[PDB]
Design a protein around this ligand. Structure first.
Ligand code: 4LU
Ligand code: 4LU
Ligand code: K
Ligand code: K
Ligand code: MN
Ligand code: MN
Lengths: 511, 510
């Protein structure tokens, strides 16, 4: 019935659509879960539900803890390849991505928001079973080693961190990676300018950065995990946008051991204290640009888990990032795209000319294509450098987009003949419409994205400055002549009369 | 059957392989031939042999002049997508392009060459029929208007110009586009630094520039039209190289109205005089980067046609350039890669490290990917900006490559984990391994390629300086640490042992 609000309805729709395979054969958390999911992503196969994982004998409740759903946001192979993404928002599964983005943009006006509603503990399935700190041992759960060279088992790849500011004015829901540190403990990334850091920075500012309450929620409402992955504004409570998107309040319940509220329908909730006063090793991970660099090591804060609540037969969703295409593309890039569309929308100049933006997956969410209406472009009476200075100041440096676009390294301005969602069209335009280096405006005083390989393995990690450009793929005269024409030399570029005769009668030609 | 030496054998082997579609229904040379060929390239369909072109009723011999063969160098839909390129050289049709290129490169040694052999006219099928000047009217032949906004009907898109230097030391076979100017005339591109220009320049040097003898041959031996598209060196005679590649001399015959030699197995030979001091309108054309710019306009020199020889039921092969992939990618791009690879083969530094080079068609032949052996790279005790200057200087400024590599505007240095022939792999490495701008080395004094749309519709068309860069997609430590380690996060990047999944896949999904 409602896959936006209920993880298990999400699973049931995929099963109904023929886009889910239950695997009853024993699969090993050590490396095979990741191989399978990867082969699923890459060939656009059905999402695998792993019912029979190889279990450690000391696991405290193996019949319940846990199965793995993989590829929850991976592309589908038969119809609309973005079905799984549409489904997270409870939309028609054939809703294509450009429209999925319009739906999110459409619902970004705060007047559409609906705050979550508290309900009693017996309306939540995950409140059926409990583990205290003493009983908890994360070492024994079937947490996968997703990639060779991963510095730990990454238990948190598709659940949601719930952190609240000390004054209670902002409750943030987001995704960030997490690996098992020891029996009772998870460490993961907590970096500028991510909200998990902003919010915890507040607890630090008040001298309580050792005992920051957190919940970590697995199998949350699919619309909730989608937004958990979207960079909505600083200070914004994700729950309220999720509500609008669902035209319905997210039902939530209070934790057992802190006063955070978590969704009624989760598979498993982990409760504890984020400890920003103790650093620990958090291991390299195979991430969104397609590498694991096994010798890359750094220290990160520690989440001390004191409690766990979980339902019968818990299912954990999982993301196993690498080459395109996967959740670190469809969700990290798609949702950057959606928020940047919204924000641009509200820009008095950029809203007149920008038709659409999208992060082509082929570029691992390092590029943002920006589709410009040339007719309205002429009216502005501008040029390549000045439009590029405006765009990049806005996307790289504004208080609006400083964080939102932080992962992006190249912005690609193109005219409105190119469906930016079709990479054959984007790559044609990129190689044929910009002079190497000359039509790339370099911004040196911007914060680079530390995960970009070219930065992590280069000098940009030491310097922490620059690395970005805005590339204009719009011919000089497209800025001045509104009747500028070229014929695009493919079949679809022929005159309508010709295409129609040839297409209608193709069987007469190619018999 | 010899598809290297005989066009009709080439056609027969595609037929035999299921990669040919005889079209007997009437197709119009006005836009339709072009629209059908565009759909066939783009969907990698069988090559279309149009048996029934809509004829002007005044054509002097419509049963013979002419049929059209489309997509001769297009990609095939079923096995080795490059099978047509292989058969041009007479190779097994499943020969992959890397291996096609190795073959061309292996045979670049002048030792291996074999000059052509003169045979009597009664050995040439195209000597069966003849047209004198008074009889010729190019405007009644079913020449196609290939793209909307083309300035004229482009008759020459897969034929071979033959021009010989006054001193008869150098004879060049090449492709350059040519449209019909009038009932007796073709105008075509003759621009720097192409050999059509270098060789005709010589006549203008000698003051005899208005009467340069030429032949223009169609349906020439597929190995010859293939080399006709390869930038072999200045002053090198293509016939010799082609013979080497065919392990047989190309049978040639003498033109009727001049002393030029033309392949004996052609469909139609045109003969006449290239007039370098009569410049006429040579209207825009749908070109290799995907665009026809309808109000781009220049003038070009004139080929006056005085004689046509042809054979029963002449076939004209054609190329209808545009979006990837078509002959302006597999041939223009592939052979620039091939000649580049060989020339790099003779460089005392670059041959230690370069495994392959390729123009990915997705980049419309503006990009050259250069695959570098990492272990041998370390031994060079070098870094990004030094290697970039070296590589960029050689391809853009050396007497060896100034012309060869003229079409390329971005050279991309990648390590040897990247199969540079699989664009999925190349674009991964491009986007993720170079910092924009910091890792691009601009060259501002080199000659830009004037066809490139960012040039043609930009200042580079005027300034004729710059427009190019070398882009490093090799991590700094790849140059110093030989054991530099990273895991590729696709399926093929997991340990060989984790076979288990592949061999047992049906147990998971079944
Ligand atoms: C969907 C998704 C997004 C990842 C991501 C992953 C997924 C599956 C993983 C789990 C596979 C592994 C790593 N990723 C992290 C991440 N953000 C971050 O700070 N650290 C991360 O380690 N994100 C990006 C992050 O979720 C977005 O930037 C959100 O905007 C964060 O929320 P916020 O805007 O509330 O800070
Ligand atoms: C296969 C091929 C190659 C084209 C070509 C085409 C095809 C089908 C067309 C017919 C689609 C249209 C235009 N092209 C021209 C061209 N070179 C050139 O100088 N002017 C051209 O108009 N070439 C490239 C040219 O043939 C190569 O650069 C050769 O190296 C030139 O021979 P040369 O080295 O002896 O000068
Ligand atoms: K978020
Ligand atoms: K040539
Ligand atoms: Mn947030
Ligand atoms: Mn030549």
């Amino acid at each position: 019935l409602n896959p936006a609000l209920k993880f298990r309805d999400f699973i049931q729709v995929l099963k109904n659509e023929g886009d889910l395979i239950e695997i009853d054969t024993e699969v090993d958390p050590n490396l095979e879960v990741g191989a399978i999911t990867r082969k699923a992503y890459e060939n656009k196969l059905a999402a695998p539900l792993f019912n029979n994982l190889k279990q450690d004998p000391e696991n405290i409740d193996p019949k319940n803890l846990f199965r793995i759903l993989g590829c929850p946001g991976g592309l589908r192979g038969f119809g609309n390849d973005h079905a799984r993404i549409a489904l997270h928002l409870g939309l028609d599964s054939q809703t294509p991505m450009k429209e999925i983005i319009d739906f999110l943009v459409a619902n970004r006006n705060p007047k559409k928001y609906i705050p979550p509603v508290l309900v009693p503990n017996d309306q939540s399935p995950h409140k059926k079973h409990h583990l205290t700190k003493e009983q908890i041992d994360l070492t024994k759960l079937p947490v996968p080693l997703l990639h060779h060279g991963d510095g730990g088992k990454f238990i948190q790849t598709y659940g949601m961190w719930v952190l609240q500011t000390p004054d209670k004015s902002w409750t943030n829901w987001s995704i960030a990676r997490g690996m098992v540190h020891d029996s009772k403990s998870i460490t993961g990334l907590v970096i500028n300018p991510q909200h998990v850091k902003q919010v915890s920075d507040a607890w630090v500012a008040a001298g309580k950065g050792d005992k920051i309450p957190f919940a970590l929620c697995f199998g949350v409402p699919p619309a909730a995990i989608l937004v958990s992955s979207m960079p909505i504004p600083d200070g914004a409570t994700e729950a309220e946008y999720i509500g609008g998107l669902c035209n319905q309040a997210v039902p939530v319940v209070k934790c057992e051991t802190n006063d955070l509220e978590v969704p009624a329908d989760c598979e498993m909730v982990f409760e504890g204290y984020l400890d920003r006063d103790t650093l620990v090793r958090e291991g390299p991970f195979g991430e969104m640009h397609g590498y694991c660099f096994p010798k890359d090591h750094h220290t990160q804060p520690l989440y001390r888990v004191n409690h766990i609540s979980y339902r019968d037969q818990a299912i954990m969703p999982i993301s196993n990032p690498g080459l395109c295409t996967d959740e670190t593309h469809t969700l990290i890039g798609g949702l950057v795209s959606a928020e940047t569309k919204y924000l641009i929308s509200q820009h008095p100049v950029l809203s007149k000319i920008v038709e659409d933006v999208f992060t082509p997956y082929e570029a691992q969410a390092l590029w943002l294509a920006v589709k410009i209406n040339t007719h309205e472009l002429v009216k502005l009476k501008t040029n390549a450098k000045e439009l590029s200075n405006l765009v990049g100041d806005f996307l790289f440096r504004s208080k609006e987009c400083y964080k939102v676009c932080s992962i992006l390294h190249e912005i690609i301005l193109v005219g409105d003949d190119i469906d930016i969602f079709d990479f054959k069209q984007l790559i044609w335009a990129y190689t044929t419409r910009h002079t190497p280096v000359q039509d790339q405006l370099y911004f040196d005083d911007v914060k680079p994205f530390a995960l970009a390989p070219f930065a992590s393995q280069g000098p940009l990690i030491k310097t922490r400055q620059g690395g970005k450009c805005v590339t204009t793929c719009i011919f000089p005269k497209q800025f001045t002549d509104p009747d500028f024409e070229f014929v695009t030399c493919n079949f679809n570029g022929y005159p309508e009369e010709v295409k129609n005769k040839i297409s209608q009668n193709w069987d007469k030609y190619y018999k």
